[PDB]
Write an enzyme that holds these catalytic residues in place. Structure first.
Site, PDB file in Angstrom:
ATOM      1  N   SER A  43       0.789  -1.218   0.000  1.00  0.00           N
ATOM      2  CA  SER A  43       0.000   0.000   0.000  1.00  0.00           C
ATOM      3  C   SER A  43       0.831   1.283   0.000  1.00  0.00           C
ATOM      4  CB  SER A  43      -0.954   0.043   1.186  1.00  0.00           C
ATOM      5  OG  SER A  43      -2.006  -0.945   1.101  1.00  0.00           O
ATOM      6  N   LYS A  46       0.176   3.755  -2.829  1.00  0.00           N
ATOM      7  CA  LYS A  46      -0.937   4.688  -2.852  1.00  0.00           C
ATOM      8  C   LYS A  46      -0.454   6.141  -2.922  1.00  0.00           C
ATOM      9  CE  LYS A  46      -3.957   1.454  -0.494  1.00  0.00           C
ATOM     10  NZ  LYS A  46      -4.736   1.235   0.698  1.00  0.00           N
ATOM     11  N   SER A 210       1.290  -3.279   4.006  1.00  0.00           N
ATOM     12  CA  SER A 210       1.388  -4.619   4.545  1.00  0.00           C
ATOM     13  C   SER A 210       0.864  -5.578   3.489  1.00  0.00           C
ATOM     14  CB  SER A 210       0.566  -4.737   5.828  1.00  0.00           C
ATOM     15  OG  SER A 210      -0.737  -4.265   5.621  1.00  0.00           O
TER      16      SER A 210
HETATM   17  C1  LIG Z   1      -1.786  -2.109   1.736  1.00  0.00           C
HETATM   18  O1  LIG Z   1      -0.669  -2.494   2.029  1.00  0.00           O
HETATM   19  C2  LIG Z   1      -3.057  -2.830   2.109  1.00  0.00           C
HETATM   20  N1  LIG Z   1      -2.788  -4.215   2.397  1.00  0.00           N
HETATM   21  C3  LIG Z   1      -3.679  -5.171   2.123  1.00  0.00           C
HETATM   22  O2  LIG Z   1      -4.772  -4.953   1.613  1.00  0.00           O
HETATM   23  C4  LIG Z   1      -3.300  -6.595   2.462  1.00  0.00           C
HETATM   24  N2  LIG Z   1      -3.391  -7.613   1.624  1.00  0.00           N
HETATM   25  O3  LIG Z   1      -3.816  -7.507   0.355  1.00  0.00           O
HETATM   26  C5  LIG Z   1      -3.558  -8.774  -0.262  1.00  0.00           C
HETATM   27  C6  LIG Z   1      -2.804  -6.893   3.675  1.00  0.00           C
HETATM   28  C7  LIG Z   1      -1.880  -7.843   3.810  1.00  0.00           C
HETATM   29  S1  LIG Z   1      -1.565  -7.896   5.425  1.00  0.00           S
HETATM   30  C8  LIG Z   1      -2.643  -6.732   5.842  1.00  0.00           C
HETATM   31  N3  LIG Z   1      -2.887  -6.290   7.026  1.00  0.00           N
HETATM   32  N4  LIG Z   1      -3.246  -6.282   4.770  1.00  0.00           N
HETATM   33  C9  LIG Z   1      -3.649  -2.029   3.238  1.00  0.00           C
HETATM   34  N5  LIG Z   1      -2.607  -1.494   4.041  1.00  0.00           N
HETATM   35  C10 LIG Z   1      -2.624  -1.322   5.307  1.00  0.00           C
HETATM   36  C11 LIG Z   1      -1.408  -0.659   5.883  1.00  0.00           C
HETATM   37  O4  LIG Z   1      -0.919  -1.239   6.867  1.00  0.00           O
HETATM   38  O5  LIG Z   1      -1.020   0.353   5.322  1.00  0.00           O
HETATM   39  C12 LIG Z   1      -3.858  -1.184   6.065  1.00  0.00           C
HETATM   40  C13 LIG Z   1      -4.241  -0.413   7.184  1.00  0.00           C
HETATM   41  C14 LIG Z   1      -5.158  -1.668   5.404  1.00  0.00           C
HETATM   42  S2  LIG Z   1      -4.961  -2.880   4.131  1.00  0.00           S
END
Ligand SMILES: *C(=O)[C@@H](NC(=O)/C(=N\OC)c1csc(N)n1)[C@@H]1N=C(C(=O)O)C(=C)CS1
EC number: 3.5.2.6
Length: 261
Positions: A43, A46, A210
């Site tokens: 993420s 973004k 993540s």
């Molecule tokens: C961005 O990194 C995004 N991550 C995800 O949507 C995840 N998996 O998609 C396959 C994911 C893997 S582990 C986990 N907790 N989410 C978003 N990023 C975060 C971040 O930590 O920035 C979030 C708060 C929401 S989901």
């Protein structure tokens, strides 16, 4: 132990792979570790999508207030803000804020769709001189973070350079630069990551990510009280698909590289 020795030792203890790039804007010096190696952005990508929309808004004074319809079918795996707005609208500015400050995946997808697809985000990065960044997929599949997969990757150094350009430099018009910085400073998702490794009163803007393979990332701009800004990328990924995420490693890395500053 030198800073480099400290980073190598952190990685050794980590059970994975750590990537760090710090740029000290006081003197343009750097602290680099696997900084030319590729990591899945998750993420953290973004920031590039939101910035691409900000760039468009420079030449379209109505863009940021443009309505975007939110439907139940737009909801994905994680969308705490967009789900509040199903059957209604959010503006492109509100989608930028949600994507950056809550990591709302639906919001990211609306930004990508508005721009015309992931490849348009890559083109925007290229327009800033970033030869490394690539966006290939929408959310949530951009977070698969499979070892060796080039999709949705960059290097720590490329991302630090581009984040510097975006927030402190040559990328955006002044109002849009300031808007990006406001968004990053108001992030809610980064308490336990880079921020946790820094003095509590330092002003910070960041974006986390993540994904699978325990991939745990954060990119930040840091404003010390008595020093020029620092730009810090900390990326971390693990060998096993279902590994736990490890924000503690990012905090620990931040503490190591900001010592003395
Ligand atoms: C961005 O990194 C995004 N991550 C995800 O949507 C995840 N998996 O998609 C396959 C994911 C893997 S582990 C986990 N907790 N989410 C978003 N990023 C975060 C971040 O930590 O920035 C979030 C708060 C929401 S989901």
């Amino acid at each position: 132990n030198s800073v480099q020795q400290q980073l190598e030792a952190l990685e050794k203890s980590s059970g994975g792979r750590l990537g760090v790039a710090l740029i000290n804007t006081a003197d343009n010096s750097q602290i680099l570790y696997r900084a030319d190696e590729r990591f899945a952005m998750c993420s953290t990508s973004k920031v590039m999508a939101a910035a691409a929309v900000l760039k468009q808004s420079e030449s379209d004074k109505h863009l940021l207030n443009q309505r975007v319809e939110i439907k139940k079918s737009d909801l994905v795996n994680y969308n705490p803000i967009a789900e509040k707005h199903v059957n209604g609208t959010m503006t492109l500015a509100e989608l930028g804020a949600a994507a950056l400050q809550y990591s709302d995946n639906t919001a990211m997808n609306k930004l990508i769709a508005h721009l015309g697809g992931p490849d348009k985000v890559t083109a925007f990065a290229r327009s800033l001189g970033d030869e490394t960044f690539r966006l290939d997929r929408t959310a949530p599949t951009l977070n698969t973070a499979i070892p060796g997969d080039p999709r949705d990757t960059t290097t720590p150094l490329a991302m630090a350079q581009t984040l510097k350009n975006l927030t402190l430099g040559k990328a955006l018009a002044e109002t849009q630069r300031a808007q990006l910085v406001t968004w990053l400073k108001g992030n809610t998702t980064g308490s336990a990551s880079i921020r946790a490794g820094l003095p509590k009163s330092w002003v910070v803007g960041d974006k986390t990510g993540s994904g699978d393979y325990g991939t745990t990332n954060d990119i930040a701009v840091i404003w010390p009280e008595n020093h020029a800004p620092l730009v810090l990328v900390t990326y971390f990924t693990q060998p096993e698909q279902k590994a736990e995420n490890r924000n503690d490693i990012l905090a620990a890395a931040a503490k190591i590289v900001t010592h003395g500053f």
